[PDB]
Amino acid sequence: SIKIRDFGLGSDLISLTNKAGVTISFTNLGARIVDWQKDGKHLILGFDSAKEYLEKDAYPGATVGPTAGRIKDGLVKISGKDYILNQNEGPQTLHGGEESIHTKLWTYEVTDLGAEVQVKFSLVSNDGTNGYPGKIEMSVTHSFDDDNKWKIHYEAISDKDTVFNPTGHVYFNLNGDASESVENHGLRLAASRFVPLKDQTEIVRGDIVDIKNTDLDFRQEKQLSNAFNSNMEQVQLVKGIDHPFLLDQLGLDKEQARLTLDDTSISVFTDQPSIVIFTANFGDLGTLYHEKKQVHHGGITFECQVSPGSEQIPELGDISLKAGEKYQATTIYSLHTK
Amino acid sequence: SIKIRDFGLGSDLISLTNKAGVTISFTNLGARIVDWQKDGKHLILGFDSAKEYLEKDAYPGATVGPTAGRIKDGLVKISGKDYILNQNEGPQTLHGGEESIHTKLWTYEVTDLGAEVQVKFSLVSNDGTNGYPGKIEMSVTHSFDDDNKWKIHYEAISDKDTVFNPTGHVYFNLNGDASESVENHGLRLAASRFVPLKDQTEIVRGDIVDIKNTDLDFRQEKQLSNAFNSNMEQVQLVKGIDHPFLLDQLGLDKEQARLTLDDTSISVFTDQPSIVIFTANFGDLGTLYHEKKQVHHGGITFECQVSPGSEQIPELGDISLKAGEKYQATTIYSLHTK
Structure with a gap:
């Protein structure tokens, strides 16, 4: 089944239910996922109306970009020249700048393939928008399959050399209760390195760090508590986890992380080099x-x-977007109940 | 009566019916007017889905800006510096540049006052969009009365010094059929002067012209065919009318233009100086x-x-908008059937 409803402020709500009776919903307001249930269970964090996102927190579950994360001083070097993008957080550019793509109503088309339904969101990022060279024709597809798979596929083209590194901003919470800490969940991640933050400013510091000893080792499945009730100077800094993890194996094939609570679990797979x-x-x-009321540690992304930082640590990778080149990304959230 | 419907591609159709049974409808895509009927006959031009607009012509009935008209070489001078805007038509900047405000899905809130139903459309022009310094926060309100009054109230406020001068691109066709030329309409226009174009480029010339002794003289009501038939340099140039006409008296009180076909007539009020x-x-x-199939001369806006051209003919006024100041503009289309 597919059901279209009015989300408020002119926005739509596209909800899909599979043969397993698992529901899921997205909105064109920021090309986000609004909810994902399972037995009257919320597995994610979400509001009931568009107004809620615009008034409380506009990032949850949204497609964030053009550049996700922070950019020191909003500075970027494109083909030599220094460009300054919209400074959102002090002098930094937080997730694309002020009133970015997460706050815009994307147009959309739905395609029912039977075992899978796809909702293709489109939006055009004008030349110069928020300092971003362009125009950047972007599209984000959100699909749900009959075997509990939540897939996100990114596509982009630009008339000009630019920068592009968008992401999906969902928060999970198997307790289904925002007043309940993600403390009890087990986490598994195929990350052995991490990128420390210099300050409360939250910019990157320049390091790459062997997380081997340190509590930030989820290679082996281990409770969230371990990191929460911990003392690294990093965890103390962010008062939890607000870091970029680097993965060991690259490829869409591989499980890169696993979020589990009891019988219900959520598996990760990406095209990307970091989480x-x-x-x-x-x-x-x-x-x-x-x-x-959400509690401290009320959820996790x-x-x-x-990784954010590229600008300071090129080792991280290259976020540029050549004019005419077709950008593509794929991330998958697969829910299991074994 | 108020009715909301999906209009396509994620857009909505908002239809207002008055006590008189006259219906009007708008879309959040481009904060535009889609239709206006009386007795089962259209008074304007418009399509039946969002895709038609993006496919055949995205201008009709839309909110156009940030700057309505063509800016020679996309050049505007702000606060001392010169700025180059999106070049949309050759070296020109036509209607705000490419993929502008008429191409976007605005958010909206409906206000029902009984005898009056307001539909407030909102959109943020990000700083740098199509080269426009900013953030520009805009709202365009479309309302419809029990006494057949359609009104567009515009509002805007920028974070930086910029330029702002939108318009409403409605096209009328009292025949209710695109195949029938508007030649048969009567027009009355309170304008003594008009700004001539210089070439098929349609850029402005620098000249203001006295239209007495010309077929373009509409002070005294006359049939449209009088102008279409003219062998006036300009008329011939454009192959009809495609000019700004400078209204003689200013003020929201005055009827500046009246378009008539049989028992039906549209009167035009505005606070602006040209049409x-x-x-x-x-x-x-x-x-x-x-x-x-629309005929040549199948509509009239x-x-x-x-007036466009102020850039080369400062006499035309000043389009600038200073950070902080509240821009406002009001234009009204009123239906009489006497």
């Missing part, structure tokens, strides 16, 4: 999600992209 | 509207704004 893991260190913010 | 008139000189192009 930024943010564990909602909001403290007493307490954003309401379904009339339920798995933002798959090219 | 750009374009009689769809589409030759054999034959754009299909409602399955009807009334684009209320500051």
Whole structure:
């Protein structure tokens, strides 16, 4: 089944249900996933209306870009020349700048393939938007298959050499209760390195660090508590997890991380070289999600992209987007209940 | 009565019916007007889906900007410096540049006042969009009365010094059929002067002209065919009308233009100083509207704004907008059937 409903402020809500009866929903407001249930269970963090996103937190579950993460001083060197993008967080560019693509209503088309439904969102990023050279014709496809697979496929073309490194901003919470800490979940990640943050400013510092000893080792499945009730100076800094993890094996084939709670689990797969893991260190913010105040560590992301920092640590990779070249990315969230 | 419907590609169709049974409809795509009927007959041009607009012609009935008209060489001078805007038509900047505001899905909130139904459309022009310094926060309100009054109230505020001068691109066709030329309409226009174009380039010349002794003289009501038939240099140039006409008296109180066909007539009020008139000189192009091939002279617009060309003819006014100041503009289309 497929059901289209009005989400508010002119936005649509596209909800898909598979043969397993698993539901899922997206909105054209920021090309996001609004919810994902399983037995009246929310496996993610979400609001009930567009207004909620615009008033409480516009990032949750959205497609964020053109550049995801922070960019020191909003500076970027394109084909030599220095460009300054919109400074969102102090002098930094946080997820594309002010009022970026997560706040825009994307047009969309749905394609019912039977065992899979795809909702293709499109939006054009004008030449110069937020300092970004262009224009960048972007599209984000959100599909749900009959065998519990949540897939995101990115595509982009630009008239001008530019930068492009978007990501999906979902937060998970198997407790289905925002007032419940993601503390109890087990995490597995095929990351042995990590990118430390210099300050509270949260920019990168320049290091790459062998996470081998350190509690930030989820190679072996281990509870979230280990990292939460921990003392690295890094965890203390961010008051949880607000770091970019680098993966050992590259390729869409591989499970790169696993989020599990009891019988229900969520597996990760990307095309990308990194997964930024943010564990909602909001403290007493307490954003309401379904009339339920979120708690510190109320959820966790798995933002798959090219690590933020590239600008300072080229070893990270190259976020540029050649004019005319077709950008592509694929990330997958596969839910299991074995 | 108020009715909302999906219009296609993620867009909505908002239809307002008055006590008189007159219906009007708008879209968030381009904050535009899709239709306006009385007695089962259209008074304007428009399509039946969002795709038609993006496919055949995205201008009709749309909100156009940030700057309505053509800017020679895309050049505008702001606060001392010179800026180059998106070059959309040759070296020109036509209607805000490529993939502008008329191409976007705006958000909206409906206000029902009974005898009046307001539909407020919102959109943020990001700093740097199509070369426009910014952020520009805009809202365009479309309302419809029990006394058949359609009004467009515009609003805007920028973070930086910029330029702003949008318009409403509606096309009327009192025949209710694109295949029937508007030649048969009566026009009355309170304008003594007009700004001539210099070439098929349609850029401005630098000249203001006294239209007394010309077929372009509409002070005293006359049939449209009088102008179409003219052998006036300009008329011949454009193959009809495609000029800004400078209104003599200014003020929202005055009827500046009246377009009539039989018992039906549209009166035009605005706070702006000029009216750009374009009689769809589409030759054999034959754009299909409602399955009807539009004829050359198959429509006529009334684009209320500051006359285009001020850049080369400062006499025309000043299009700038200073950071912080509130831009506002009001234009009204009123239906009488007397």
